[PDB]
Amino acid sequence: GQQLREAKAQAAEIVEQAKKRANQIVDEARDQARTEGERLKAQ
Amino acid sequence: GQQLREAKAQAAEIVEQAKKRANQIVDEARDQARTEGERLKAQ
Amino acid sequence: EAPSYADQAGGNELLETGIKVIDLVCPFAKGGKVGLFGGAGVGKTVNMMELIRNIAIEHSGYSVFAGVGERTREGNDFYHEMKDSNVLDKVALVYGQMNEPPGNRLRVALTGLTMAEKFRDEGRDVLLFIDNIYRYTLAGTEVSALLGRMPSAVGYQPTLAEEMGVLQERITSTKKGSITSIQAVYVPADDLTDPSPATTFAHLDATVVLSRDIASLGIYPAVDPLDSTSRQ
Amino acid sequence: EAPSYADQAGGNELLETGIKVIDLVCPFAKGGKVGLFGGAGVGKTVNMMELIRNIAIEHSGYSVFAGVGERTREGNDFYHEMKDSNVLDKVALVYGQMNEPPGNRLRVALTGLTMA
Amino acid sequence: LNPSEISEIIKGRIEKLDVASQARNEGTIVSVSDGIVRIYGLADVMYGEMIEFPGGVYGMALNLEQDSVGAVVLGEYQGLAEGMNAKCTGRILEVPVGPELLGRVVDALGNPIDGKGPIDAKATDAVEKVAPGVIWRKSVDQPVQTGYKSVDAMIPVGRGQRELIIGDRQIGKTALAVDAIINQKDSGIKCVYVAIGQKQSTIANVVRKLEENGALANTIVVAASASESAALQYLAPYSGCTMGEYFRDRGEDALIVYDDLSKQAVAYRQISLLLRRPPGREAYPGDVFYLHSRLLERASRVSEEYVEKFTNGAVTGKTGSLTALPIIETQAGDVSAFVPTNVISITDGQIFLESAMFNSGIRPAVNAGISVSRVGGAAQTKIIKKLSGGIRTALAQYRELAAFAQFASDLDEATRKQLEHGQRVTELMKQKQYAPMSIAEMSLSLYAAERGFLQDVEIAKVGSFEQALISYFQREHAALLAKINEKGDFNDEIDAGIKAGIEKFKATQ
Numbered sequence A, B: 001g002q003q004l005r006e007a008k009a010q011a012a013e014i015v016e017q018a019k020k021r022a023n024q025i026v027d028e029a030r031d032q033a034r035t036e037g038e039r040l041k042a043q
Numbered sequence C: 001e002a003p004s005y006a007d008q009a010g011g012n013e014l015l016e017t018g019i020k021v022i023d024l025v026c027p028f029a030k031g032g033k034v035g036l037f038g039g040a041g042v043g044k045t046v047n048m049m050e051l052i053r054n055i056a057i058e059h060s061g062y063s064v065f066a067g068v069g070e071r072t073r074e075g076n077d078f079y080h081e082m083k084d085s086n087v088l089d090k091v092a093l094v095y096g097q098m099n100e101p102p103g104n105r106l107r108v109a110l111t112g113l114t115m116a117e118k119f120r121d122e123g124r125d126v127l128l129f130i131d132n133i134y135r136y137t138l139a140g141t142e143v144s145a146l147l148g149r150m151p152s153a154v155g156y157q158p159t160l161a162e163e164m165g166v167l168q169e170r171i172t173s174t175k176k177g178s179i180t181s182i183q184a185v186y187v188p189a190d191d192l193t194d195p196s197p198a199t200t201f202a203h204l205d206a207t208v209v210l211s212r213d214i215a216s217l218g219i220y221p222a223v224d225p226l227d228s229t230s231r232q
Numbered sequence D: 001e002a003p004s005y006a007d008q009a010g011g012n013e014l015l016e017t018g019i020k021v022i023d024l025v026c027p028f029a030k031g032g033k034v035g036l037f038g039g040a041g042v043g044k045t046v047n048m049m050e051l052i053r054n055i056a057i058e059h060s061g062y063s064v065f066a067g068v069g070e071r072t073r074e075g076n077d078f079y080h081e082m083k084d085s086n087v088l089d090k091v092a093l094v095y096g097q098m099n100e101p102p103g104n105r106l107r108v109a110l111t112g113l114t115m116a
Numbered sequence E: 001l002n003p004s005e006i007s008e009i010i011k012g013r014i015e016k017l018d019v020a021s022q023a024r025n026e027g028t029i030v031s032v033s034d035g036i037v038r039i040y041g042l043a044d045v046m047y048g049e050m051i052e053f054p055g056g057v058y059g060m061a062l063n064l065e066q067d068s069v070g071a072v073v074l075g076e077y078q079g080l081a082e083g084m085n086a087k088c089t090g091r092i093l094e095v096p097v098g099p100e101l102l103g104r105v106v107d108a109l110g111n112p113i114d115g116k117g118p119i120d121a122k123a124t125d126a127v128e129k130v131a132p133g134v135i136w137r138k139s140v141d142q143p144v145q146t147g148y149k150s151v152d153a154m155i156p157v158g159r160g161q162r163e164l165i166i167g168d169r170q171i172g173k174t175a176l177a178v179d180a181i182i183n184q185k186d187s188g189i190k191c192v193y194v195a196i197g198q199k200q201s202t203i204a205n206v207v208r209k210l211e212e213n214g215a216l217a218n219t220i221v222v223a224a225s226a227s228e229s230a231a232l233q234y235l236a237p238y239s240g241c242t243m244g245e246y247f248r249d250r251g252e253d254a255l256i257v258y259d260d261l262s263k264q265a266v267a268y269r270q271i272s273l274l275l276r277r278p279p280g281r282e283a284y285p286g287d288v289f290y291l292h293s294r295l296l297e298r299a300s301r302v303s304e305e306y307v308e309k310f311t312n313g314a315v316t317g318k319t320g321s322l323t324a325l326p327i328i329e330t331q332a333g334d335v336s337a338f339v340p341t342n343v344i345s346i347t348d349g350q351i352f353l354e355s356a357m358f359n360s361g362i363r364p365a366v367n368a369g370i371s372v373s374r375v376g377g378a379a380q381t382k383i384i385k386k387l388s389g390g391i392r393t394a395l396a397q398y399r400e401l402a403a404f405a406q407f408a409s410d411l412d413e414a415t416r417k418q419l420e421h422g423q424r425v426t427e428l429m430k431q432k433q434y435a436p437m438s439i440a441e442m443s444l445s446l447y448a449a450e451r452g453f454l455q456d457v458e459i460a461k462v463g464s465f466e467q468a469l470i471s472y473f474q475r476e477h478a479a480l481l482a483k484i485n486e487k488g489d490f491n492d493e494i495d496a497g498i499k500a501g502i503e504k505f506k507a508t509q
C-alpha cells in the first residue's frame, strides 16, 4: 500500500514538472517574438 | 512475496504512463510556442 | 358600433378544456370571454396554444387568429403547424407584429374582429384568438402625445378606458351567432395594479392570472388559484 | 474630448502605492479609478497625504486635488495639515466651495482634470 | 520604403473631379441646445434624412414642422452655431456595408477609428428597416456553439435565435459573449460586436483579446463609448445590425452582440426627455419597448425564396440567418424591472447569471433553474442532445441539497447518491475564460458525467480528471474525435469506442 501511494504521488509530480516546462516554453517564445517585433519597428 | 512483486511492477507502469503524458504536454506546448511566435511576427 | 342591449345573448353552457386548474377554479363557457393575464415569459402563449389544441376537439366551425404586436417567428410556426396538419382551411390569420409601425399595431385587431363579426352575423359559432391585446393599448400610448393629448397617470393616454371599451364591446355573442374568445393580456413589470390590466379585468367572463413565483417553483401551467375567478 | 481609441495605452499595468494592504488586497491600475468609502475620523486625509508623498517622491509625479462642494472650515484645515506634513508643494489645490452657485461646483472637477 | 512617384495620386483625383454646378436645398440654423438644432428652410427634406453642416458634422431630421425642422446631431454639437448653413444630402441615414468591414473598428456612422486607413466599401444600406414578414421565415435548426459546456449542453443557441444574456454587473456577460464570438473563427459564421456606453479602455482590451485569439479578422467592431453623444449610442445597434444583415440577405450566417441594450435605452431616454416627450415607468418613453423590438426582430432566419428574391437569382438554394445575443444589466437581481421584462417578452429565451454562484467560484455562473431556450434540441447536434438529458436534473437535485453537505453522513442512500451526483455535475460545468471546447471534448465530459464514470472520483479531482481524459483521447483516439467533430453524429460504434477508451483510461491511467 505504501509503494502504490508513493507511485501515484510521484506521477503527479512528473505531470506538474512538465506543466512548468510547458509554461516556460510558451512564455519565452512570446517574449522573444515581442523583442524581435520592437527591433523591426524601431529599425 | 508474489503480490509484493506485482505491486512493484504496477508502480513502474504508473511511472511510465506519467512520463508519456509529460512528453505529450511538452510536445503540444512546442507546437503552441511555434504558432504563437508566427502570430506575433505577422502582427 | 357595438351591438345593442336588446341583441345580447345569455348562456352558461360549460366548455371543457382538459386542463385541471382551468376546469376547477375558473371554468369557461361557450360564447364567453377569457383573459390570460401574466408577466414576461410566464407562459401566456403556451397556454393559448394548448387552449387552441383542446378547444379544437369539439368545435366544428371557423376560427380567426389575430397576432397583435407579438413575435414574427411565432406567426410562421403556427401557420406551418396548421398547414402541416390540414386545419388551415378553417382558420383566418391576421398579423401586425412587433416589427411594424404603430398604426398597424393600433388597427390590426379591428380587422380580425371585423372578420369574426362577419362570421358571427352569418349565424355561426366562431372562435377568436388574440395574442397580445395589451399591444393595441401600448400603440395608443406611442401616438398619444403626437396627437396633442395631455398625459394621464403613469404616462398613459387619457382615452384608455374608452378605446378598451370600443374594442371589447364588439367581441360578444349576439342572438344571431356566437363568438368564443381567448385573449392573452400582458402585465407590465409584473404589477397587476398597472392601469392597462386593471381596466382589462371587467371586460371578461373568465380571468386566468399567471404567476412568476409559481413558475419559479417549477409548476406549469403556473395559474394562481386564489387570483383566478370566473362567473361560471 | 476624451483620448481616442488609438491613444489608449493598453495592458493592465499596476500603480504601486507602497501601502501593503492596498498593493495586496485591492490593487490599483494606472489610469484606474478608486471609490473610497467610510465616514470621518478613520484616517482618510492621512491616506491621501501618504499617496501624494509616495507618488511625488518614489514615482516623480504630481497630484491635483479638486474639492467639489468643499466646506470652508475643512479646506482651511486640510491646507494647514498639508503645510505641516510637508506635502503642500507636491499637490495643486482647486476648491469649489459649498456657498458658491452650482455651475462652479459643476466645473471645478474639469478645472482640476485640466491641470492633471 | 517611400518613393516619390507613388504620391502622384493627387493628379488622378484632379482627373476625376466634377466641377459642374449641382443644385442643393439649403437652410439656416436658428437654435442649438443639448444636441438638438432647429433649422429654418430645407423645404425638400425627408423624414430620417442626413443633414450636412460645416466641419463634417451630420444630423438627422426628426421633427418636420410647417415652419421649422428639428434635427438631432450625430456627433459633437458644440461647434454648431446660429447662422451656419445646413444642406440636404438626398440620403436617408446610411452606413457602409460589406466584407471590407471585417477586421475593422468603426464608430456608429462607419468611419474608422483604429488608424488602419480608409474602408473601401462598395455598398451602403439604410439604418432604419422593417424586418421581413411572416411568410419569409424558416424555423431554426442549425447549431451555434459558444464553446461552454453549460451553455451548449443546457441552453442551446441556433442560427437565427435571439438569446438574452442578463444579470448583475461584473459577473461575466461580456466574457460569455466575446468567447461566443471567438468560437466562430472556423465555423463560417461572421461576427459583429457592438459596444454601447462602455469605456474606451474596455473596448481596446476587448479588441486586443480578439486579436490575441485569432478572431479579429472575422469580426466587425462598432463602438460608441461613454463620452459620445446619446444619438450615436442610440443608433449604433441598428448600424451594426445593418452590417450583419448584409450577410443575412445573401445566404450567409452572421452573429451580433449588443453588449448593453440597457445603456441604449438610457441614451434614448435622454434624447426623448430633451425633446420634452411625456414619460412613463422609470421615466422611459412610451415607445421604449418599440426601441428594442424594431432591432431584435431583424435577427431572424430567412428562407431560400427570400434569398433568391433578394439577389435576383444569383444565390440559389441557401438560407441566411442573423443570431443575436443582447445583454441586459440588472440591479441586485431584479429581473421584474421594466426594461428587463420588455426584452424577455421579445427574445427566444435567456441565460441568467447569478451573483452568488459567481462569488462562490462557480465561474460560468449559469443559473440552471430559470435559464431556458425556446428552440432547444431542434438546433442541437445528435450526440450533445443525447448526452445532456441528465445534466439539468442532476443540477436540480443539487439546488436544495447543496446546503445539506454539513450533515449528509446521516442520510439515506438515494438522497446521498443524488447529492454526490449533483456535486460531480456542478464541478463538471466549471470552465475557464478563453478555453473553448469542441463537440468531441464536451461529449467526452458529458459521457463521463452521464454514464457513471465519475462515481469513484472525488470532487477536488473532477476537472483535472476531465483534462487528463481529453489529453488521452487526443493521443490515442484522435480519429474518433475527428469522427465526432464532423456533424455531431451518434451511433453504437461511437458509443462503444468512447466507453472502451474511458474504461482503458480508468484502468491504466
Ligand SMILES: Nc1ncnc2c1ncn2[C@@H]1O[C@H](COP(=O)(O)OP(=O)(O)OP(=O)(O)O)[C@@H](O)[C@H]1O
Pocket: E168, E169, E170, E171, E172, E173, E174, E175, E176, E363, E364, E431, E432, E433
Ligand atoms: N469563466 C471565467 N472564469 C474565470 N473568471 C472569469 C470567467 N468569466 C469571467 N471572468 C472574470 O470575471 C470578471 C468580470 O467579467 P466581465 O468583465 O465579462 O463582466 P461583465 O458582467 O460583462 O461586466 P461589465 O459590467 O464590465 O460589463 C472579469 O475580470 C473576468 O476575467
Ligand SMILES: Nc1ncnc2c1ncn2[C@@H]1O[C@H](COP(=O)(O)OP(=O)(O)O)[C@@H](O)[C@H]1O
Pocket: C038, C039, C040, C041, C042, C043, C044, C045, C046, C047, C220, C221, E345, E372, E373, E374
Ligand atoms: N407548460 C409549460 N411547460 C414547460 N415550460 C413552460 C410551460 N409554459 C411555459 N413554459 C416555459 O416558459 C417559456 C415562456 O412561455 P411563453 O408562453 O412564451 O410565455 P409568455 O407568453 O408569457 O411570454 C417557454 O418557452 C418555456 O420555457
Ligand SMILES: Nc1ncnc2c1ncn2[C@@H]1O[C@H](COP(=O)(O)OP(=O)(O)O)[C@@H](O)[C@H]1O
Pocket: D039, D040, D041, D042, D043, D044, D045, D046, D047
Ligand atoms: N496612519 C495613521 N497612524 C496613526 N493614526 C492615524 C493614522 N491615520 C489616522 N489616524 C488617526 O485618525 C484620526 C482621523 O484622521 P483624519 O485623516 O484626520 O480623518 P478625517 O480627515 O476624516 O478627520 C487622526 O486624528 C489620527 O489620530
Ligand SMILES: [Mg+2]
Pocket: C044, C045, C046, C070
Ligand atoms: Mg408570448
